[PDB]
Structures are given as C-alpha cells and as structure tokens.
C-alpha cells in the first residue's frame, strides 16, 4: 500500500491524478484552446450534468474525457478489417475504477518512456491526430454529391480521441500485450505524427477522400 | 513586359476542356481535357477533374513564360445547351489559385439568331 499512500499524498499540492501539474503544459493549436479543460483538479471525475448541457463538454477535463471514452471502448458496428472488438472479460463499461487504474498506469508508462509531461504528450497527440475536413453527401433533386466540409474544433476533438481509443483497442484486442501498453504505444505514436498509429492514420484517411470530394 | 494569354474553358455536362493559347489564339500552349485526370467517363465533367486539369495546364503555362490570362468561358452553344457545366467555376478558381493573374473573364458561347432545328425529335428527349 506504500505506493498507494504516497500517490495519495503527493497531489496534496493540487495535482492532476498524482503527478504532472498542468501549468507546464502548452496547447499549440489555437482551435482547441477554449475547449480543452486545463483546470487543475486532483481526480478526473465529476459525475456532472454535461450531457444535458449543449456546451458543457468543454468543462470536462481532458483526462476525465479520456477515461470516459476508454470505458466505452468495446464492441461496435466497426468491423474494421473484419474484427469484433468486444471486452468479454470484465468489460471496461461502468467499471470506472479499473479504467482509472489503467490510465494511471499508461500515464506512468508515458512518463518513463518519454521522460516528459505525459499530459503534454497527449496534448501534442490530440493536435496531431485531429482531421481538418470530412465529407457530406448533399443532394439537389435527388442527385447526391460528396462535398468536403470543415470540421468543428469540438467534433475534431471527439473523432480524434475516439480514433486513438479504437487504436488502443485494436492493438490490445486478442493479444498478450496489455491494454495499458497498447494505449501508451498508441499515444506516443500519435504524439510524433507516426503513421503507425490508428489515430494519425485515420486522421489522414478523413483528410483524404474529402480531399478528392472537392 | 507582362505576358497575357487566353484560357478557353469549354464546359458541357459531359466534359471540360482548358486550352491556353497566345494573345492571338493562333498558337497552342496547354490543352488539357477532363479525360486526362480521371478514369471514369462519368467523372470528366466533375469540378475536381476540372480544377486538377486546370491547375496542370496552368503550371505548364507558367513554366512557358505565361503570367496573366484572360478567361473565355464557353457553353456548348449552338442548338446545344447554354449553361456552362458545374466544373467551369471550379476550374476558374483553380486557375486563379495556381498563380495566374486573371483579367477579363467573359462568355464566348456562340449564340445564334436563328439556328437549325435542335436534336431529339418533336416530343423531346423522352427520358
């Protein structure tokens, strides 16, 4: 319990999770500045009424949102390359303590392997994995055509963060390699614009196709 | 002396053609159809084939000492349609965006006073 108590006491001087006080983090992209919540809070969970708020999603801490879209990562119409990515062994849904633990472990992994602020690594990955154009089928008189469309900063945040989560799930699913290791590997790849990540790859895919729909 | 050429942008509902010629229009410089840039015949008139081909012809003209261009928009004319295809505007924007100084942008569709009977028969193209 000694690491548990020491991590209890370390953030006594107001630190996100246990460590990595958020003052040193810098957002490079101007689009996501007024949406990524950088308020210093010990625990990334508010149980808040953000869904019933139209714009209450900007208040949620990026790490709380991270745990949020981690817990939902299982099972989908997404048969991406013909795979059903379900969590059958103690699924992440509703077990936010286990998800809390897994993000803690992946954050420690990021800290050690990158030797810098894991929150800042995540910030860079979010900037690097957000697409900038999507496609919409707009019709006049029943003659549909695919038109490139600009993406809102918040939708960009949503789609990119879901993409990295799905990349982590694709990595860990049906492999010895744990979930925390998958998430750490995916986030470091997305941090440096590595195409090997699902997040940056599908950012590129979303940018493309819409590229040709002009 | 700043060099100005002529960019004939023909646009039907099936294809678009961008032809760059000297100030007299007597010598050919760059002539790129929709067919150059796509692989489905249905795609030839689309604005993307238009702007891609237009930019290609534009850089080719730039490489050959061309800077300014007068646009000449053309519908099929004659007894055939008179509205330029959807790709003409896209191609004009592309020529602007390829680093060409745009001057007069007019229509040169030959409008007849009293032309031949058009095609299709008396009861029209009964789609």
């Amino acid at each position: 319990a000694k690491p548990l108590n020491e991590r209890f006491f370390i953030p006594h001087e107001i630190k996100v999770m246990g460590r990595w006080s958020t003052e040193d983090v810098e957002v490079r992209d101007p689009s996501l500045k007024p949406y990524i919540n950088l308020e210093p809070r010990l625990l990334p969970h508010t149980h808040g009424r953000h869904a019933k708020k139209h714009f209450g999603k900007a208040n949620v801490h990026i790490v709380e949102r991270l745990i949020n879209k981690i817990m939902r990562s299982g099972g989908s119409h997404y048969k991406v390359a013909g795979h059903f990515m379900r969590r059958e062994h103690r699924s992440l849904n509703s077990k936010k303590v286990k998800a809390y633990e897994v993000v803690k472990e992946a954050f420690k992994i990021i800290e050690q392997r990158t030797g810098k602020n894991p929150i800042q690594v995540l910030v860079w990955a979010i900037e690097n994995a957000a697409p900038r154009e999507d496609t919409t089928s707009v019709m006049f008189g029943g003659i549909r055509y695919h038109v490139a469309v600009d993406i809102s900063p918040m939708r960009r945040l949503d789609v990119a963060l879901r993409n990295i989560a799905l990349g982590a799930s694709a990595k860990c699913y049906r492999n010895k390699m744990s979930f925390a290791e998958a998430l750490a590997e995916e986030i470091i790849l997305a941090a440096n614009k590595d195409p090997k990540s699902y997040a940056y790859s599908k950012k590129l895919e979303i940018e493309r196709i819409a590229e040709s729909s002009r | 002396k700043e060099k100005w050429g002529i960019a004939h942008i023909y646009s039907s509902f099936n294809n678009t053609i961008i032809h760059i010629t000297d100030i007299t229009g007597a010598e050919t410089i760059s002539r790129w159809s929709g067919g150059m840039v796509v692989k489905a015949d249905r795609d030839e008139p689309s604005p993307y084939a238009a702007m891609l081909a237009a930019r290609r012809a534009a850089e080719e003209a730039l490489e050959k000492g061309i800077v300014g261009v007068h646009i000449r928009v053309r519908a099929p004319g004659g007894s055939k349609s008179k509205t330029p295809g959807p790709g003409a505007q896209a191609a004009i924007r592309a020529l602007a965006r390829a680093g060409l100084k745009i001057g007069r942008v007019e229509d040169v569709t030959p409008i007849p006073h009293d032309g031949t009977r058009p095609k299709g028969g008396r009861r029209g193209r009964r789609v």
């Binding site: 319990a1 548990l4 108590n5 991590r7 209890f8 953030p11 006594h12 107001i14 809070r41 010990l42 625990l43 969970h45 508010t46 149980h47 936010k96 303590v97 809390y100 | -």
Partner: protein
C-alpha cells in the same frame, strides 16, 4: 457541530469538534481506505481548504447505504458542509463553489424506475 449529507443512496451523518486533526469515516483513518478513488473523493474538500483547518478540527462521519463510491461522495458533501459551518467564512464558500458545485448543492439524481418489456436490463431497455 452537526452536519448531514445526501447522495444517491449513501447518506452520511457528520460531527465536527475541536481536535488535533484526526478525520474518521466510521471511526477509521481516512488514509487507509482500500479504494484510492474514494480516498481522493473524500479528501477533495480539505486539500484546497488548507492544512490549518485539517489539523484544527476533529471530524467523525458515518455513511450508510449505496455504494462505496457513493459513500465517498456523501462523506465529501458532509465534510464540506462541516468545514462550511465550522469556519463560516465567505471565501471558502466561494472557492468551494468555484472548484465544483456538488459539495454545496448535492447530486439529487436517482435511478429512474424500471418499465416493462424487458424491465430487467434497465428502464429504457426492450427486446429485438
């Protein structure tokens, strides 16, 4: 001084008096609670409050009902109101409501009743 706290189904009764600083849930030290997330949830009000308040008052809170996390949040509400009534200064109230709202408003949300046509899986659940 007496205080109470409501959350979900875990209800907390808290009593704060002068003391060295010991804070107890069910008469147990707050540092040795097995879940750590519940520990931070219980701990949130007195971090930002300060160490002098921590070591100037003894607080005993007993929580019954609900889940362990709900127990943590109810203890959070109870201790928040405890410091509120013991200190009774505006600035702590202002920063309490600035950090979040729950500890001065509670979470009056509950679980809606289940409805037939596959009630078991949830209220809004149904078959295929």
């Amino acid at each position: 001084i007496q205080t109470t706290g409501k959350r979900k189904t875990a209800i907390a009764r808290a009593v704060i008096r002068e003391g060295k600083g010991r804070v107890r849930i069910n008469g147990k030290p707050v540092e040795i609670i097995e879940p750590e997330i519940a520990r931070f949830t219980i701990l949130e009000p007195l971090i930002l409050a300060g160490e002098e308040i921590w070591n100037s008052v003894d607080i005993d809170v007993k929580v019954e009902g609900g889940g362990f996390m709900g127990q943590a949040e109810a203890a959070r509400m109870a201790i928040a109101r405890a410091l509120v009534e013991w200190t009774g200064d505006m600035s702590l109230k202002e920063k309490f409501m600035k950090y979040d709202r729950t500890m001065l408003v509670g979470d009056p949300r509950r679980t809606e009743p289940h409805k037939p046509n596959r009630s078991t899986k949830g209220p809004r659940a149904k078959r295929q």
